[PDB]
Amino acid sequence: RKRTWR
Amino acid sequence: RKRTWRDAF
Amino acid sequence: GTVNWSVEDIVKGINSNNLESQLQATQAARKLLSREKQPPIDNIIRAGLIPKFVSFLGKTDCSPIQFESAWALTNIASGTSEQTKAVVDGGAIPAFISLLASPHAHISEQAVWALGNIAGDGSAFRDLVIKHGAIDPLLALLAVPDLSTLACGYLRNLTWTLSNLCRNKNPAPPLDAVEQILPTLVRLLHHNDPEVLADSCWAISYLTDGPNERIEMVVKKGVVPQLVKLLGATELPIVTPALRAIGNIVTGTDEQTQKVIDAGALAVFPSLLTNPKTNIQKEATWTMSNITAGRQDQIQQVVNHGLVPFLVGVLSKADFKTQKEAAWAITNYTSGGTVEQIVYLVHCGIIEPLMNLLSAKDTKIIQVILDAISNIFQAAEKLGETEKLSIMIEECGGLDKIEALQRHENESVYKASLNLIEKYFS
């Protein structure tokens, strides 16, 4: 999985 | 007899 | 100040030979790549900004530009495989591994997050992150007497990144890498945070998804009792990977399956087999089918835990996918079970829900149910109760369904139904 920082 | 997650779904 | 800049402005600032102008333009890039609706990732890539951001990671003297370029690159690496490749091609991997040694926790955390997105892409990038030597500095970040002293968000990011180094197959992670990470995984599996526990379970579920040698590495670490405890958690994000890890382990040897039973997993199954989430019922019934594919003493533990009425339940009413897994559990049980165990199964009312499923438009479930009918009849032959079983199948409209299946498209179905009619209904 990949996760962006908002 | 035994099935892996990929074998079943 | 740095809000809603064009990509052209960012390039102008980054191409200035002014460290402060470059810092403001990198923050502007980060704010663009942080927006919810359509961040211009491909525009930032085409402008050739990735190598510039990677070189800013090395600016030890300007910790703000290290944070901003690290955040910008993390958001690009979180994109498609192509967008992750662009970050890797820009030389980001050794630069992010150096940043794990940063005295600034927010920069160090950003490097952890970036490496997790890169490793998460697939086997090749996972193994590339390992070859650049990421595991040792990552594990050194958790080298503390008590995990509770670390910041919650920081620990959650580290656990997530370690789970991504355990993820993917063809090939599975290197054995040596798995052996290095496992003692830290076991420690995170005992931490009080639900997010850390969910990600630690996912890591275990990945490592148990392979050959028995891989399951053995995990089981030998004594984690099965802790997985069974997590199997009873209230939080669905913990139960889902815990059940997957347990389900994977029971695909292994009879000895590995026994460790799951000895740990008390079967006591949780009444609630798992009636769980309001259908994916829990489905995977729990799948886990049951692999336990009923085991030894007669293991089928006996299923019986002793009162789980046969629960299997009758899921066969009678559940979503079709769970019912399909229940049919497999029944065929496995009737294949390896003793006459007494099969007698008990019929006594618990398996015939009516088993005959009702012969109306499903799925050839695999029909084959599985026909194998089960055949095995049950083989037990009735040993007792001379074939006539009694033939009447039970006739009474709940099963005979009318098996007769119809003689004119079926599938060869195996046509032959199996034809045999039962000729042997026990003629």
Side-chain angles (χ1 to χ4, degrees), chain B residues 1-6 8-9, chain C residues 250 252 257 283 286 289-290 325:
Chain B
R1 282 311 115 195
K2 304 234 208 223
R3 301 166 308 128
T4 65
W5 193 98
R6 278 159 174 208
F9 325 112
Chain C
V250 300
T257 298
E283 291 204 6
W286 160 63
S289 79
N290 283 326
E325 288 306 304

Side-chain angles (χ1 to χ4, degrees), chain C residues 41-87:
Chain C
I41 302 176
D42 286 333
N43 299 272
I44 295 289
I45 297 175
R46 287 188 245 103
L49 287 176
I50 286 166
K52 318 259 192 197
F53 296 147
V54 169
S55 59
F56 295 163
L57 299 176
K59 295 180 182 297
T60 323
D61 289 345
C62 189
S63 93
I65 211 173
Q66 284 180 306
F67 178 53
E68 293 298 344
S69 54
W71 190 339
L73 286 164
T74 296
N75 282 1
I76 302 167
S78 80
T80 68
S81 291
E82 249 204 283
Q83 299 168 332
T84 311
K85 184 180 179 285
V87 168

Side-chain angles (χ1 to χ4, degrees), chain B residues 3, chain C residues 285 289 292 311 314-315 320-334 354 357 364-366 368-369 372:
Chain B
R3 301 166 308 128
Chain C
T285 307
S289 79
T292 67
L311 292 169
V314 286
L315 198 78
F320 184 69
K321 289 172 176 285
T322 305
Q323 294 186 291
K324 191 161 173 184
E325 288 306 304
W328 272 111
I330 301 318
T331 295
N332 287 354
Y333 182 118
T334 56
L354 209 51
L357 283 172
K364 200 75 212 72
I365 202 176
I366 296 160
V368 166
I369 291 154

Side-chain angles (χ1 to χ4, degrees), chain C residues 23 55-56 68 163 184 205 237 255 265 286 359 377 394 402 406:
Chain C
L23 171 54
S55 59
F56 295 163
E68 293 298 344
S163 87
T184 292
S205 85
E255 294 76 17
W286 160 63
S359 267
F377 263 111
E394 285 178 303
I402 309 155
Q406 290 179 303

